[PDB]
Amino acid sequence: ATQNPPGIYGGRKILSRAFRNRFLELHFDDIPQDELEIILRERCQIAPSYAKKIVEVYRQLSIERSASRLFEQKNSFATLRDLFRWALRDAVGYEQLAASGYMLLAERCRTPQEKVTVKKTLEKVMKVKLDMTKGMRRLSVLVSSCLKNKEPVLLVGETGCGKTTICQLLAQFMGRELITLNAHQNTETGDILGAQRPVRNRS
Amino acid sequence: FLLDEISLADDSVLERLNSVLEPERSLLLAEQGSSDSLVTASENFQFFATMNPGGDYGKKELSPALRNRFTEIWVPSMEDFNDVNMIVSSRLLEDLKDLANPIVKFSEWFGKKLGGGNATSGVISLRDILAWVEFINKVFPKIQNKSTALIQGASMVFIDALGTNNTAYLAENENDLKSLRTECIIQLLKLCGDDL
Amino acid sequence: QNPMRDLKIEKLVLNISVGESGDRLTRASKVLEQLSGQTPVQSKARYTVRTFGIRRNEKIAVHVTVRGPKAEEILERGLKVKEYQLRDRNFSATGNFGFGIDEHIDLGIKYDPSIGIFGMDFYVVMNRPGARVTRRKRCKGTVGNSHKTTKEDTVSWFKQKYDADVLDK
Amino acid sequence: LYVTDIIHIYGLRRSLYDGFCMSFLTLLDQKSEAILKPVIEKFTLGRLKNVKSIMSYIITPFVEKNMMNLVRATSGKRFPVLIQGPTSSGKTSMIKYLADITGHKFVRINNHEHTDLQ
């Protein structure tokens, strides 16, 4: 069994009293930053500023704005496996940490006001962590260069705002299956199984 | 898996996508060819598609576990100085290029006013500006035809988006000082005379 | 006077102490190579220590000496790292100077986790034209007093071109 | 069902704290469990006068030893253990990361809102 606390998230129902007597209570908290700082950082050539700032910035940003009923933006949510994808892909630090970290927790906002504080606060820690448009072009190269490398990329936003250029260019540039499907209000779990079967050949 | 309106669906559809990348299975068993035989395992099943947010009218909010596993692209709507002008300049350049400045200035202000929570045609975006700017490409050669047609073309959804133009009833502490069409129709006289 | 008694850099010598031989040293070496293009030199322990865990002749440190233009690049490049602030010590009475940096990445150079992170030091020895007199084979001489590099003279040199700051008393 | 799970004549006097703290302190949702292990920790200490010969991705030290003994005995005894904590904190990785030690099978399932008794 597994799940979250009923007192933490609002709208959650409690368990039964008959099933609570035969159910073992196993408490499991999150991992520390010391045990996750040795994995996010390849070697000692990258420095501890990226691993320390990645856990310190995500630990404060994830706690300052969670997806519960106490936080503002519920769309912005990260985990321990989300830092490995941004830390493992960012082997060369310097200016790729802000562009690679701006589409992780700062790209989960609604407008530019929620991404300005997260992007500015998350990108302002890189200058203090190490002693030493641009937003569209900085994410366009990383998104287009990381979209062809693999991974589940999601393009949220308005319809026809610019989410068809990445899918059309990425789907037209590379050789895929081309499984286009138009979801509506009656799109349940049977739409994927019903639309995925007799597509390619089968005649 | 290309999905257009995957965030506009109700309950169901996120259970398979949320377990196909995390668990590595197709839900709690396949519907076609299930029973007590082989299980549905996913070793090379990827997912690439876009969609809308959960704050839209008619759209449902996704889970934090399903949104935290995938990369969220930070791309909202276009601006009203380069996106609305460049996206509305195509097709309206053959007719009048001077009438495409006041059409994108009153379409971005009203779009942030008329929500989609009221009616089904109350929601605006690129479809209203593109349809209103592309549907007014053929008019008169004078300023009266272009101004009247352009000022009466966007109202078809502006004044028709509301539930009622005016209401009169005996309420307790509720008095209507103004209408709901006067505020959206009072900017046409200033916008039609300011630009033109 | 001054004509021909300018103040070139004689040489920059980067140095990596590593209380052991083996991989961790050949990696320090690899660093100095790719950074200088010159293949670097190894140094053996002079006696055995134990509290440092080293034996006489162990191979314990690499270093490399670099001269002209290439010198100035790496100087400035790591001089950057040090935010252009040395200290009033750091300079020898005979007019040379140095600093350490840890993390050899803070000056170009990627990361590579199969290489690790090493410091970034190196001394800068200064001279003027006619240093050769004290260095050639025949008629080996010592350089005249009013020609010798000094602390005053080199600090002032540093404070100037580079623009960097000195610091402390 | 816990005290009879692990048999020793020095572990019987030390199994009261783990058995009494395994189902109450870890099952608490509030912060009213910080003052309940003071009596069990001082009452279940050095009291057995022996006989029995002491015989029967990331990686953390709290889930690789603090949840292996209780999870192995609780999962091997025949009890339904529940994972309490944050969403995606590592409650699903504990079973897969702790199932590689012993000969057991783990199947990750993703239930929805339409999961009734039928």
Curated annotation (Swiss-Prot), chain A:
Stretch forming the signal peptide: none
Compartments (UniProt record): Nucleus; Nucleus, Nucleolus; Nucleus, Nucleoplasm
TM helices/strands, residue ranges: none
Highest taxon in the source lineage: Eukaryota
Binding-site residues, ATP: G157, E158, T159, G160, C161, G162, K163, T164
Family membership: Belongs to the midasin family.
Description of its domains: The protein has several distinct domains, an N-terminal extension (35 kDa), followed by an ATPase domain containing a hexameric ring of six tandem AAA protomers (between 28 and 40 kDa each), a linker domain (260 kDa), an Asp/Glu-rich domain (approximately 70 kDa) and a C-terminal VWFA domain (30 kDa) that possesses a MIDAS (metal ion-dependent adhesion site). The ring-like ATPase head domain associates with the RIX1 complex on the pre-ribosome, while the flexible tail protrudes from the molecule.
Note: Present with 538 molecules/cell in log phase SD medium.
Function: Nuclear chaperone required for maturation and nuclear export of pre-60S ribosome subunits. Functions at successive maturation steps to remove ribosomal factors at critical transition points, first driving the exit of early pre-60S particles from the nucleolus and then driving late pre-60S particles from the nucleus. At an early stage in 60S maturation, mediates the dissociation of the NOP7 complex (YTM1-ERB1-NOP7) from early pre-60S particles, rendering them competent for export from the nucleolus to the nucleoplasm.
Subunit structure and binding partners: Associates with pre-60S ribosomes in the nucleoplasm. Interacts (via its hexameric AAA ATPase ring) with the RIX1 complex (via RIX1); this interaction is crucial for recruitment of MDN1 to the pre-ribosomal particle. Interacts (via VWFA/MIDAS domain) with YTM1 (via UBL domain). Interacts (via VWFA/MIDAS domain) with RSA4 (via UBL domain).
Protein name in the entry: Midasin
Gene label: MDN1
Curated annotation (Swiss-Prot), chain B:
Recorded coiled-coil stretches: none
Localization per record: Nucleus; Nucleus, Nucleolus; Nucleus, Nucleoplasm
Written domain comment of the UniProt record: The protein has several distinct domains, an N-terminal extension (35 kDa), followed by an ATPase domain containing a hexameric ring of six tandem AAA protomers (between 28 and 40 kDa each), a linker domain (260 kDa), an Asp/Glu-rich domain (approximately 70 kDa) and a C-terminal VWFA domain (30 kDa) that possesses a MIDAS (metal ion-dependent adhesion site). The ring-like ATPase head domain associates with the RIX1 complex on the pre-ribosome, while the flexible tail protrudes from the molecule.
Family the UniProt entry places it in: Belongs to the midasin family.
Function: Nuclear chaperone required for maturation and nuclear export of pre-60S ribosome subunits. Functions at successive maturation steps to remove ribosomal factors at critical transition points, first driving the exit of early pre-60S particles from the nucleolus and then driving late pre-60S particles from the nucleus. At an early stage in 60S maturation, mediates the dissociation of the NOP7 complex (YTM1-ERB1-NOP7) from early pre-60S particles, rendering them competent for export from the nucleolus to the nucleoplasm.
Subunit comment: Associates with pre-60S ribosomes in the nucleoplasm. Interacts (via its hexameric AAA ATPase ring) with the RIX1 complex (via RIX1); this interaction is crucial for recruitment of MDN1 to the pre-ribosomal particle. Interacts (via VWFA/MIDAS domain) with YTM1 (via UBL domain). Interacts (via VWFA/MIDAS domain) with RSA4 (via UBL domain).
Other observations noted: Present with 538 molecules/cell in log phase SD medium.
Protein name, per record: Midasin
Gene designation: MDN1
Part of the full-length chain shown: 1489 to 1684 of 4910
Curated annotation (Swiss-Prot), chain C:
GO cellular component, one term: nucleus
Annotated compartments: Cytoplasm; Nucleus
Disulfide bonds: none
Keyword terms: Acetylation, Cytoplasm, Methylation, Nucleus, Ribonucleoprotein, Ribosomal protein, RNA-binding, rRNA-binding
Modified sites of kind N6,N6,N6-trimethyllysine: K70
Domain of life: Eukaryota
Modification comment: N-terminally acetylated by acetyltransferase NatA.
Major subcellular site: cytoplasm
GO molecular function list: RNA binding; rRNA binding; structural constituent of ribosome
Pfam families, sorted: Ribosomal_L5, Ribosomal_L5_C
Matching InterPro entries: Ribosomal_uL5, Ribosomal_uL5_C, Ribosomal_uL5_CS, Ribosomal_uL5_dom_sf, Ribosomal_uL5_N
One GO BP annotation of this record: cytoplasmic translation
Similarity annotation: Belongs to the universal ribosomal protein uL5 family.
Record note on quaternary structure: Component of the large ribosomal subunit (LSU). Mature yeast ribosomes consist of a small (40S) and a large (60S) subunit. The 40S small subunit contains 1 molecule of ribosomal RNA (18S rRNA) and 33 different proteins (encoded by 57 genes). The large 60S subunit contains 3 rRNA molecules (25S, 5.8S and 5S rRNA) and 46 different proteins (encoded by 81 genes). Component of a hexameric 5S RNP precursor complex, composed of 5S RNA, RRS1, RPF2, RPL5, RPL11A/RPL11B and SYO1; this complex acts as a precursor for ribosome assembly.
Miscellaneous comment in the UniProt entry for this protein: Present with 39000 molecules/cell in log phase SD medium. There are 2 genes for uL5 in yeast.
Function of the protein: Component of the ribosome, a large ribonucleoprotein complex responsible for the synthesis of proteins in the cell. The small ribosomal subunit (SSU) binds messenger RNAs (mRNAs) and translates the encoded message by selecting cognate aminoacyl-transfer RNA (tRNA) molecules. The large subunit (LSU) contains the ribosomal catalytic site termed the peptidyl transferase center (PTC), which catalyzes the formation of peptide bonds, thereby polymerizing the amino acids delivered by tRNAs into a polypeptide chain.
Protein name in UniProt: Large ribosomal subunit protein uL5A
Gene designation per UniProt: RPL11A
